[PDB]
């Protein structure tokens, strides 16, 4: 419509599109656990294909893209090829507008707090529709068509992708534990890890990359150890051969796991004085890795989104052949004279060099630039996190400080000033050493959950810390029986 009216809002097309609205009832505690494993069982069906039969026959889709997979929360060639990718992206966009301060919002008012939340989920569905027109301009599917079933395929992914942003919301309304953003990231590791390492071996051939030889743990250890039902023997340790060592991919899920679960165990210890006594008391640690968790999700997402220098949006302009303002000067994604063909020289030096083999030590220059960029982006979103609410440095420090002195009643001192020395200089660099440790674990190797595993077993040890403290200090089956509790005073 038009008429003569002054508008710029696209109000009338909004209820003409079947969007979403979300629950309603929630139930704990046996119906939190039941409905959040039910959520993970609808995700589980990634075995199912996607409709499209000229691309599922002879080409059977092009080779798996192992770079997107770990941060999307996706599986290729199914209903959930995008996962959380546009949902987190609408978080990147509005973390950028709010935190750059082109748009300025103070989030302690109810009206504009929930304006932000509503705007994000609308922009997640706007980002969904443009992502599925990005993914057919990528040339991933092994065919490019005029509008026929290339129109239907993009509809399907969006119609099961507005579902995966419903999963995020349903869990978050209290009908599941944790957040459904965290959960789908930590069952990406579940799908990918034991497909890779336990697997099963089958016999078929294929010139292109196929999943025929997979199940590294069984292949390696049982040939080393003895013999099985399968007739095997001999030890395969390390090779640069076409056939995988099997040892290589077994080591590099463990290697990262040890050192990224221990970076959260490096903690910032904060004294208090006391709880009942006059004298030394709690060592009160704060999580190192979990503060920077949403900061480094923003940081890692953007390395697969930038037009100037990232994977998805330069694979489009390599595929598309008119050369103008946008051209494959952004990067060249094509077959190479090199034995292994991944982009020969792009401007994507923000690309991870790792694959599901060993790292790359043959180019130190691309290593340095990659590490440098993600540390800069890891402190970019650290100070946007500080700027945009949460437990703000200014607000919380100010609040307790003047609340305490004159109150009630009354009261006096806190440790807030002396830990405003410690906390804000540990917050920014706490997402700069998290972006450093994800890359150095990736350097060893591992792909297709390269950085998904790291935040999923240290997101599984973050989970462990919360539940153990609840059990043993708040009540339940407890360990307070050994020595407790608070003594002093008189």
């Amino acid at each position: 419509m038009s008429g003569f009216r002054l508008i710029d809002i696209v109000k009338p097309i909004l209820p003409i599109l079947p969007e979403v609205e979300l629950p309603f009832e929630k139930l704990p505690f046996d119906d939190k656990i039941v409905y959040t494993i039910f959520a993970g069982l609808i995700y589980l069906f990634a075995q199912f294909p996607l409709v499209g039969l000229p691309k599922a026959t002879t080409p059977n889709v092009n080779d798996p893209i192992y770079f997107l997979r770990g941060v999307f929360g996706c599986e290729p060639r199914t209903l959930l090829e995008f996962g959380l990718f546009p949902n987190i992206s609408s978080g990147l966009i509005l973390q950028l507008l709010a935190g750059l301060k082109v748009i300025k919002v103070n989030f302690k008012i109810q009206s504009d707090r929930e304006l932000f939340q509503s705007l994000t989920k609308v922009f997640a569905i706007v980002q969904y529709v443009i992502l599925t027109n990005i993914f057919i301009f990528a040339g991933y599917f092994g065919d490019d068509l005029s509008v026929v079933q290339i129109g239907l395929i993009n509809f399907q992914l969006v119609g099961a992708g507005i579902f995966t942003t419903l999963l995020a919301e349903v869990i978050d309304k209290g009908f599941g534990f944790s957040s459904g953003a965290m959960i789908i990231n930590t069952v990406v590791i579940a799908t990918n890890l034991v497909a890779d390492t336990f697997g099963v071996s089958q016999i078929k051939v294929g010139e292109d990359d196929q999943t025929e030889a997979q199940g590294a743990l069984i292949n390696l250890i049982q040939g080393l150890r003895s013999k099985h039902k399968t007739f095997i023997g001999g030890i395969i340790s390390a090779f640069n051969r076409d056939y995988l060592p099997n040892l290589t991919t077994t080591i590099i899920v463990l290697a990262i796991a040890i050192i990224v679960c221990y970076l959260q165990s490096v903690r910032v210890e904060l004294p208090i004085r006391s709880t009942r006594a006059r004298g030394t008391n709690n060592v009160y640690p704060i999580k190192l890795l979990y503060t920077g968790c949403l900061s480094v999700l923003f940081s890692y997402t953007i390395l697969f989104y930038i037009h100037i220098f990232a994977f998805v949006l330069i694979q489009l302009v390599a595929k598309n052949e008119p050369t103008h303002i946008i051209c494959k000067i952004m990067g060249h994604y094509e077959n190479a004279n090199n034995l292994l063909a991944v982009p020969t020289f792009p401007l994507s030096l923000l690309a991870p060099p790792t694959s599901f083999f060993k790292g790359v030590t043959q180019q130190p220059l691309t290593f340095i630039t990659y590490s440098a960029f993600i540390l800069v982006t890891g402190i970019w979103f650290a100070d946007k996190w500080q700027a945009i609410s949460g437990s703000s440095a200014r607000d919380v420090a100010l609040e307790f400080k003047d609340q305490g002195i004159t109150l009630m009643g009354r009261r006096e001192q806190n440790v807030a000033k002396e830990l405003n020395k410690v906390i804000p200089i540990a917050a920014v660099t706490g997402a700069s050493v998290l972006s450093l440790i994800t890359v150095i674990g990736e350097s060893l190797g591992l792909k297709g959950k390269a950085a998904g595993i790291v935040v999923g077993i240290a997101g599984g040890f973050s989970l462990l810390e919360v539940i153990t403290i609840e059990y043993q200090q708040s009540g339940g089956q407890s360990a307070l029986n050994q020595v407790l509790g608070v003594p002093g005073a008189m």
């Binding site: 979403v20 629950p23 309603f24 609808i42 294909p49 996607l50 099961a160 349903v170």
Partner: peptide, 21 residues
């Protein structure tokens, strides 16, 4: 307000549709 069973029904009928076609 919709319900948490409407979202549940939508997906399991979508998964059914894809295998069928």
């Amino acid at each position: 307000r919709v319900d948490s069973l409407v979202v549940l029904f939508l997906s399991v009928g979508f998964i059914f549709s894809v295998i069928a076609l």
